[model samples]
Each structure stands twice: as structure tokens, then as C-alpha cells.
Target: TALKVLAGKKLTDLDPDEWAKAQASAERILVDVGTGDARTAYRQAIAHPEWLVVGVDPAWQRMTETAVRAARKPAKGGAPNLVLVSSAIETVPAALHGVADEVMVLMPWGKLLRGVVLGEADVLSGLRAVAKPGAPLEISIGTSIWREPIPLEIRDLPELTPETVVSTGLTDRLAALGWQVADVRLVPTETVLHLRAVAVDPRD
Candidate 1:
């Protein structure tokens, strides 16, 4: 399958030139998976010119406006260090494998949320595939089962908590999947569950 990447206003297959540009701009790379609109990735790229910030999402429509904006001249808020990819982690581009120094999943929804919260083997492996050994992983769970109009996929899942992590054996599960959980905490702001982890093995 082609790795559809958002370059300027169009969705194009990833090319070597694009990857080269990313490497040229930064030694460090941060990939924001399930990056809905790429706003966070855009800001991070603008803030850190020494890091390549990649925003990844399966829904390209949600990322279009921001992707277009980021293609403009830097003086007009463009982010040269930012790359937008139209793909889910499960089938991320091969070029991205072992490329990221850090990864984040912020407020994911739908299948992405389910896969992450449950620590599904495939999803966990997919996340590990993109990061180098010892790369940090940060996941913020902003939604819960109690949220109004819950999605069908997450309806059967339990609320995420530090206790839930331990109760469900998620720590051991994640360790088997090559991600080591360093900490799991409940954020005071809306009781968001945050998981701080690191890749314990080399990229798959």
C-alpha cells in the first residue's frame, strides 16, 4: 500500500526527496499519531526547528486545512520541519520505521483509542515499529466510557486508570509488546489518563 503523505495541498505517495528534507531539517523526530487536525504537530514543529514533527492520521480530510497552512512560507506560519502523513499507525510508511525519537498519541478516538487503551498487541507493535529503542512514548486519554454519545468501539471498554492498568495486566502486556510502562497517572484536568512509556526494543 502506498504511504499517502500530505505535501502542500495534495496527498501523494512518500518519496525519497521528502524523507531527505525531513532528515536534513532535524536529527530528532517526533511523531504524533492520530493527529486529528495536525495543530499540535504544527505548533511543535514551529517551536522546535531542530526536530522533525510528523503528524499522522488516517482521516486526511481532518488534516487538510492545517496541512495546507503548514505548506505556506514560514513567515506566514508554515512549518518546514512538519510532515503530515495520511496513514494509521498499523500501516505507517516503511520510511518512518525506526525514524522517530519520540512519539505521542493525544486524545485519540474510535479504533485508535480502543487499540491504545486496551494495549492491543498489533497496535502496540505498530507503535513500537516507528520508534527507536528507548524512545519515549506519551499517550493522553481524554475521553472515557462515561462520555456522552460514546463510540461503539469503546463502549465495551472500561475507564482507564492506574488501577485499571495494573488490574488488566497492561504493564506485562505492554512489556511483551516491547513498550515499557514507566508511569501511569491520572491528570487532574478532567481526570485524563496519561501513560508514560518507552520503547524497550529496537524497531520492528
Candidate 2:
């Protein structure tokens, strides 16, 4: 399982200080998209009593029944204010739009990269739907080059990479729509690259 892969391997684990920083930046509301296993984020929210965490995944059954159950039972302080929404990231409620102060999109860099390759403007547009102007978008992608460069199997994904995605062309594309890259990092020990971006203007 992907969660196991993250847990068992030499994955980039966040330390308590980093975790605290993330929670503080979350501003009591966190929206995690494409959560294969909600345990890690759930644990973080539970640790910080002041925060409310929402985990969204298209695989509703796996998420609520399996993932939520596997997470540690709510601590004595209080159960983490968690909501598992069985929905696609693109369709998060308008009410939830621009609500999260911190957003994490992990391991889905492959899909975003494919979207760029396919010219799927809607994919980016959908992301814009839930984003707040100036709110950060944190993205992490695997950097290992696959043995083959065949067409991406995932439908409607973009081929964004640490190298290609933030280039002048893609930056222009996003800037035209009022998004801007605020920061970027190439994490050590893994091919994971993180980008911190913000909305510069309200969406049309």
C-alpha cells in the first residue's frame, strides 16, 4: 500500500517541529486531496487540538472504512475534528472553496505532469476552484525517471515536473490565471520536489 511505502521506506518524514509548523500554518482547517491513507494527516490534526482536518479521496469506501479505522483512535484531549469526504478533488464544495489555509497534494505529481502533456486546462482550472487568492498550494512529486517514457496511463493528468512545470511557459500559463509560484524545494533523500504557490488574484 502507498501508506506502507511511505511508512516503511526511507521516505521524507516530517519531524515534530516541521509538523507543528504545518499545523500552525493550517489555520484550523486543512484539506488533504488524494489521500490514499488518511492516517498521517489524521494523526497530525489529532495532535493539534485546535485544528480541523478534512480528508478527501475519490475512493470513499477505502478511505472511511479502511483508512480512518486504521488511524489511531482519537486521543483524550479530543477526537480530531475530521471529515472524510468521498469526492474528487476537482469538485470540492463551493462553500469549502478558498477555505483551507494549507493544502497538501502529495505523490500526484505524475498526474499533474500528465495533465500538462495532454493540455488539460480543466485540471488546473479545477484546482483553482478551491484555492484562495494568496493561499499556498504545496505539491510533492516523485523525481525518479521511469525506465520507459511511454504515454502516461492516467487519464487527464499533466506531465509537470520540478524542472518542466515551473518553467517560464507553465509559469506564464498559471500567471495568466492569477497564480504565482512563491517558493520551491528539492527535498533530500527522495525524488520529491515541493512547490509553494499562491493565488495572486481572484478567479474569474
Candidate 3:
């Protein structure tokens, strides 16, 4: 449920006054980078008024349908607290630095997806920038489908299967980039392997 589908606003374009307002009033900040029509943001906001949930998706066209519904009134029904940002992780606003209480990366694909498991510098850097000291970086790493069609550069990639995320020392590799993984569990299925990890930020 799209409680509020605020149009994508650029961090650079944001006025300091409003940005600070959102930052100060919220008890905790939750970020969903690479969010794609995941209505959980809407549901979470509707349940918790004190929390600010920011969802970022570079592809704006993918979000229009829900955006329309979110704009409607609650009598018409929606949460005024929701803000959907249209931007890439690379250009995330400086205003958001060190503000996130928790960050969620769910079912990521494309270049962003590989960088997470492989510990690529740029990708980790962007995620690290928003994360606050000791914040939780929650992830649900699912099996990538057609994207695996090519011969991937698996040089530093963790296993695609759920059998091993930590046993392969993937968590140790992630710690080098500032994430200290605390939990690793596999939700298994016949076709897909879903890995759930909750890591803490010990550095960066």
C-alpha cells in the first residue's frame, strides 16, 4: 500500500530547511536503495508514524502506478510520511550522510547486485556513506535469474546458492568494506536460494 508516493526529489535540489526538518523529527531513518514497487515501505510507514522510510529507485517509470495511489487522501487513503526518491546510489545526497539508522537492500540486480557480494569499492562506498556508526544493514539476497545468463565475473562473488555465504568467508570479505555480519540464514526453495543477513557497521 502506497500511503504516500512523493515524486522523486534530488538531494542536490533539496532545500536545507526541509531536509533538516525531515532529519530532525524522525526517530529513526530507514533507507531502501534500489527499491522496486516493494509496498512494504508503504505498510511500514502506515504502521509506524515516528519512522521515516525513504525509498530510492533510479527508474522512475517503474513507480508511476503506485505513485498515483499514494498521492490520494486517507479518506481516499494514503500515509503522508512516505517519500519516494528517484536517484542512483552513486549520487545520493551529502545531506543524508551518517543519517540512516538501518538500510535495506532486497533482491538487487544489475551492477549494484554484484558489488554487494563481491565487495566492490564504489558500491560499498555509497552504502557506507549513508550508514551511521553501529547501524544495521539488512539484506535479503535472492538468486538472480536471467542476469546470470552471461559468464559473470565471479572473481570476488559469493556463492549464488544459499549453501554458503559465511562458510565461504563472504562475511569476512564484507567486513573489510565496513560490514560485520552478525547473522546468516538460508530460506530454501527448489528454484531459488534466498540468503538473509543482518550485519553491523563496525567501521566506515
Candidate 4:
């Protein structure tokens, strides 16, 4: 239900330039964590040939394999020069450090909240550690609670709360981690809030 509600919103409804910047920024270096279907980012990068894309997911057996097959297929001009890797965000190797120009975190926000709020994991810290200074991390989260428990269609879905959707406290926590909030807005007619954040390296 929440996913259905989010899917209907148009990116055009937001500031065109902001969305454009995100797209342009994505063109150079793109890192996607927990990518279920890598096609979305793959298509975006294909549109802008200047970008080098990398998608990381621990569950490579399912999603990554599908993406790799798609990437190898023939296209009109050429297939996307995309790299899909099986790795967890938390432990990304040092060799990959500073490799991404832009890191996109399109994972479920409510799930992250449950981990952070419940103290099961330090989600933000884990994310921040992988990113370079001044690199942008685009994040989105659902704002409203569902009326009932939803089925876990995906493997890593976390229990959610409406409060997690509307919480400015989450933003504050991220700010504390040296990430500057570049943009924050509610997706039109949906329970989603999209954020653009730039990681401020303490050394800088």
C-alpha cells in the first residue's frame, strides 16, 4: 500500500532543477545500496553516458544476477557500462573508497528507522562511513503509517511506523553525523519524504 502510494507521485512535482542536479550528479559516479532491481539506476545512467554506475547488494544471488543479465543484453546504441557488485554497505572495502561521486540510498527508510530506533544497528553511521566528503547521498523515507501490517514482499523489509515517516528527529540525527541537509520535502500526495544530503568530512 505504501509502495503503491509512493509510486504514483511524479518527480516533476518537485523542483525541476533539484531533480536535474541529482540526475546530473548521478551521471559521473553512482553507488546504489540495497538495490532490489538495478534497472532504475541503470536506466538513469544510460540516459547520461558520462556516468559510471556501481550497485551493491548482499543478496546478489537474486537481484544482482537479474541486473547483470540485463546489462549484457544488446541495446540500440550500447548497453550501460554498469558494475553490479555483491557487497554490504557497512563493510565496503577501502579500495572502493572515494570511488563514488554520488551515493544513492534508495532503501526503505522505515526499516532503517526500526534498526536505529531499536538500537539494532547504527544505520546512518554505517552509511556515512562509506561516503567521501562532499559526496551527496540521496535518501527517501515513507512518512505515514499503514493501517495494518503489510506482507513482506521483499527479503529485508522492516516493520514500520507512521512516526518514522514524519520525524524531523531523524534529520537532526543525520546532521549530527556531519551530513548537511541540502534539501528536504514531502512527495506530493504521498507519505514519502525525499532528502539530499552532503557528507561533511570531519577532516575537511
Best by TM-score: 1
Stretches of candidate 2 off by over 4 Å are 1-27, 66-78, 109-113, 116-119, 145-151, 154-161, 202-204
Clashing residue pairs, candidate 3? 3-79, 73-77, 74-77
Can you write out model 2's per-residue Cα lDDT over 12-32, one digit (the tens) per residue?
Answer: 222445434544555567667
TM-scores, all candidates, are 0.91, 0.68, 0.76, 0.65
Regions more than 4 Å wrong, model 4: 1-27, 73-80, 107-121, 150-168, 202-204
lDDT of each: 0.83, 0.55, 0.65, 0.55
lDDT score at residue 117, model 2, on the 0-100 scale: 33
Q: Which TM-score value belongs to model 4? A: 0.65
Candidate 4: residue 20 Cα off by (Å): 27
lDDT of 1 by residue, 20-100 (tens): 676766878998999888898898988998898888888988888898888899889988788888877887678878888
RMSD values, in order shown: 2.4, 9.5, 5.1, 11.3
lDDT of 3 by residue, 1-204 (tens): 111224522122445677668868999888887777746677777777688877777775676556556567876547656667666676666766777888888777666677666667677667767788777777666554425464354434545654466565556666767776666565654344443334354453
Prediction 3 global C-alpha lDDT: 0.65
Residue 148 displacement in candidate 3 (angstroms): 8.5
In model 1, state the lDDT of residue 97.
87
Best model per lDDT: 1
